[model samples]
Target: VKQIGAQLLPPLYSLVFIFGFVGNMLVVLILINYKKLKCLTDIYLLNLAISDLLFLITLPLWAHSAANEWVFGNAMCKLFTGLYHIGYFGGIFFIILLTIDRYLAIVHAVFALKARTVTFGVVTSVITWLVAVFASVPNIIFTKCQKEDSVYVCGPYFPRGWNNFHTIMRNILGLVLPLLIMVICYSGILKTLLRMKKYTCTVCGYIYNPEDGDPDNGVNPGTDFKDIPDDWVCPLCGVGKDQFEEVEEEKKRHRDVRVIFTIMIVYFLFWTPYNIVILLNTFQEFFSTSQLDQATQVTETLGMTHCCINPIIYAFVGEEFRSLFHIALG
Candidate 1:
């Protein structure tokens, strides 16, 4: 039988390497040089960009190996395979950190404000990298380069046991855990925004008269909210016209928190099942890069590519990361 191997790789990997490298590098540049990138969001995002850049740095080798064979020698074989796992698990750990950050802003607003210091974010990033490095040790130890059944394999050290363990761990720690955290955080945030908006409007003594004249205007143009004299100022930031000047500033901050929250949830959804499928399919005899069915092989290959997609999301999606390209390199 023909070794239906990494040949399924070249074309897709070519595009992934091309776009992933460019996009990640752009994010690094934006975050490094842009002055606005000093906030907690920018810091975590910068680290995420760096992680993706590292993944991009090694793509060519993987693409090459997939295109060629196990000719890169033992040292490279180890390094390349090890790095693939390193970047995969490392990227996931940071994804979790991002979700936790969102939780702070959305669900634990008071604690989020105080606990979200630079020191905390940096510490979180470092710990994530460290744990990921440790978790990926199995990959480094086992991902041997070998030719089996006339097919060259350059991934995961052990065939059944070791590789299986690695796959399960990645899905649980790297995919499932992070995804669970992201959903919980985003859901909480969405709930808070809705609940708080309703509670404040109703509790603030504004009689919703039939002709209340745009009570939602937030300008108190209606029922003499000023007459109540209860500090008329809503400190959670939805103030009346008197504070309209500060409205933009306050609202921007809230918008930023909400935006990042939504972002993380979307990211989890994008990358989760892909890993889950990879783990599930491993039990089948059809997992070899050269042997898997067309649909399965294509899906697994795409999962590999997802390792480099998040940075692109950050670069173009947020106000803080608006200039992601300028910050990373600078």
Candidate 2:
């Protein structure tokens, strides 16, 4: 992207920094105030914001690096790049944690509710950060300023198999799996949404049923919580067979999770191909020709630019944020 022109770097980096910083800060604020911090999902979101904020902190340095070249010294470059990876991993891990949380909420609500608590969330956040920081160790170790021919590149460039192994592993585990987890969670959510719709229709059909002998003489089976299939609806799990009603709330909760999950999925799908192409380009030694790699990068920059567009995506996708924005503006 820096190759495009120095003119492009400022605006691109500005966008990235502006949205990333604001998005991360607002998320942190919401985690602190608007929502109860007792849920693991809330804890993970806070951790993600902290991670993204750290990465955003280094973006200006990167903007400087891209604009004027690496004047921050090799040590600072390595340190920042390492911290960047650490933050990247932290955000990615928390995303995965959120997926797992959604899965539990939809599939095993009782289990999730039992596991959810402020203390437990804190512990999970700590563990996630610890693991994410560890993932950055090699990045810092291998990252530095390197001169290839006359151009200076500020990033991880290691000899032998080290670079390939590390980058591939980190990219796959941190990125690929997180996307896949989101996919699975959303798939489950979609299924539940459909079933819930059907179940509601069935109940509506029964309530609106005018037959069955007499309107005044008939016992309307009402809403049978058991009649709705468990697999199709997001229910408060551990509800006994003889328990009471399941209402519209389960569907609403699933819809919220589905909305965010869909937004994230679309974002990843847009970026993953481009990143894969760029990764291939970065590993020129692994390929005989650079044509495909260059083409992909050129083609992929559009997708790369979408990363900076996350704020707009989130604001539109999240109902609470959407309503708050309107209220604040009014």
Candidate 3:
């Protein structure tokens, strides 16, 4: 375990940091290029990208800590954990909003079209961020980058019997409620879209309809692929027109969303167990210092991987992301 901690964790985190930093920033750049926000989806996606970008900044600290101790000290530790919690919870909150927008678009198009405005999107986004920051207060209070057995660590500091407070709060706020909402929102949107005889991508929930021609992209209604301009690229994932393949049963829908699905899948895979372990630690005399220390190190590193995965998804899968990525490189 110690060998893995010393050798494996640093390189892995460094790689994740590089990919996530570049990819998410592309998403942000695309959004910023617009004169005004396009829609609720754009707002939500921008918020999502920003949160991940901020969260990714903290990865190197942990990567460094993996090889050594928390050499940055408690001040950095508090700032790092606080920022991470804000972005981590913030990402989830924005996702919830994004899902809600899709639900309104599909099942309640009339309402969505009428009531969903730039003001509405902006206001809700601000509130969600505020909530994310508020929720992260506990991380700031309870966590610090501190030393234990000559090795500094960054995580929660539970009082002798006060473990239940942190555990129950995390389970209810972080896991239980948010997961329920996520399942409900996505499941309803998916089920309704199927019944309505339409399809949308799983990522940002782009509806699959080539006939409409993307007015936002200057593609005339019913424009064919061969006629598209060489310079024109996909507005969503930033893939090129020639590269897009129309497969059976909404291929575009699947492609974009699979990228998004990867984000959610990995998030839960890494976070759930980590959260569970933290909750378990609340039990009186539940785990030894070494056992719990090893588990925390492993799970926390795994969860932080979410920071970089989304950007990696966009870069590898989305042509536009790659095309734009070059701008940063240049």
Candidate 4:
């Protein structure tokens, strides 16, 4: 198992580092250039990218250590371990904030109008960073570069009960709580989307068909009601667009919801196995230490792969981001 990890983990970590760094860097660049952090979602996304990059920066060192031993000494060991935990917790916390941001935008739109300001997002993000730093303190304090056998290694050498405490805290705070929050937010969003209907001009009693946009008014076919110009009036009665209201459309909603749900599911799937393995390892009796160590290495690497997947998810599922990314590439 040791030989296998020494061979396998380095290459895996290096792969994660390369893809994660490039993907997250592009996200940061695109957000800064185009999105400009003007909106709450943009703020959360920027922070999330930073969190992933912070985590990714430490992977190369770990890759080297995996192939050989920790040669960066004690200071780097503590700093990188601190960065790893902070990045982990910060990324997850930002995801939670994003879920809540979307929930407010969709489920409680009226309240979100005032609540989801850029200033509020910035403040909350700062608070989240502070919390993440607090959570990382234990790991930073416990991590050390020490000789194990004939080689030096760096990792948290938790003393007895602290290990159990850290594992449990990690699972509850990182996985379980975030999962619960997302489920609630998405369920509400789903219900709202499901109940949504088509836009109808209240004065003229004319329904707007997204599939057959008002051609006479120069609105193209397949144009959503929201996408129509504000000055657009009801063709029949010439009433302003603001007079239009939602009526009844069942199948048209939830497309973007599917994308977000896919992201959520992918996140959970990637991290759950690692959390489960580590949680089970708390018992320490069911599996040999060597077997658990190998399992941890594999699952941890799998979890690290998630840092790169979000940008891919955005490219595939986000229309605006895809177009923007292409424009930037050009």
The TM-score leader among the candidates is 4
For model 3, residues 1-330, the per-residue Cα lDDT tens digits are: 877888998899889888888778767877779324655567787899989987989888878877776677778888998778888888877766665665565556643353556778788889988888888886688886667787778767867554577578767766887678768766775665444343344444455455676789787765555566899866787755455544344433323444554556656777898888877655646457667767876888778887766666656754546656677699
Of candidate 3, the 10-residue stretch with the lowest lDDT total is 246-255
Q: Give the per-residue lDDT digits (tens) of candidate 1, residues 39-98.
A: 676677777767666666776776676656667777887787656666767766665666
Q: What is the lDDT, from 0 to 100, of the residue 287 in candidate 1?
A: 46
Residue ranges of candidate 1 with Cα displaced over 4 Å: 1-8, 110-116, 150-152, 157-161, 198-250, 257-270, 282-296, 320-330
Candidate 4 structure, TM-score to reference = 0.79
Give Cα distance to truth, residue 107, candidate 4, Å.
1.1
Q: Rank the candidates by TM-score, best first.
A: 4, 2, 3, 1
Can you write out model 2's per-residue Cα lDDT over 254-290, one digit (the tens) per residue? 6568455754676576656755765676567657455
**Cα lDDT tens digits for candidate 4, 228-324:** 7787788899988777887643432234555566667888999999998898877666557777776876898888778888888878876657667
Per-residue lDDT, model 4, residue 8, is 85
TM-score of each prediction: 0.70, 0.74, 0.71, 0.79
45: Cα error in model 2, Å: 1.8
In model 4, the worst 10-residue window by lDDT is 248-257
What lDDT, from 0 to 1, does candidate 3 have? 0.71
Q: What is the lDDT of residue 147 in candidate 2?
A: 80
